[PDB]
Copies of this chain bind each other. A is one copy, B any other.
Amino acid sequence: GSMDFPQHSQHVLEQLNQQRQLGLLCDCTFVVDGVHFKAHKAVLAACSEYFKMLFVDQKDVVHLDISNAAGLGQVLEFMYTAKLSLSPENVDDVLAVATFLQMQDIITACHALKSLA
Residues in chain A within 8 A of chain B (CB atoms): 1-16, 19, 24-25, 27, 40-43, 45-47, 52, 55-56, 78-79, 81-87, 104-106, 109, 113
Contacts and interface: CB of A to CB of B under 8 A. Distances in A.
A2 B46 contact: no
A8 B42 contact: no
A42 B45 contact: no
A5 B108 CA distance: 10
A13 B2 CA distance: 15
Contacts of A5: 10, 13, 78, 81-84, 105-106, 109
A3 B98 CA distance: 14
Contacts of A41: 25
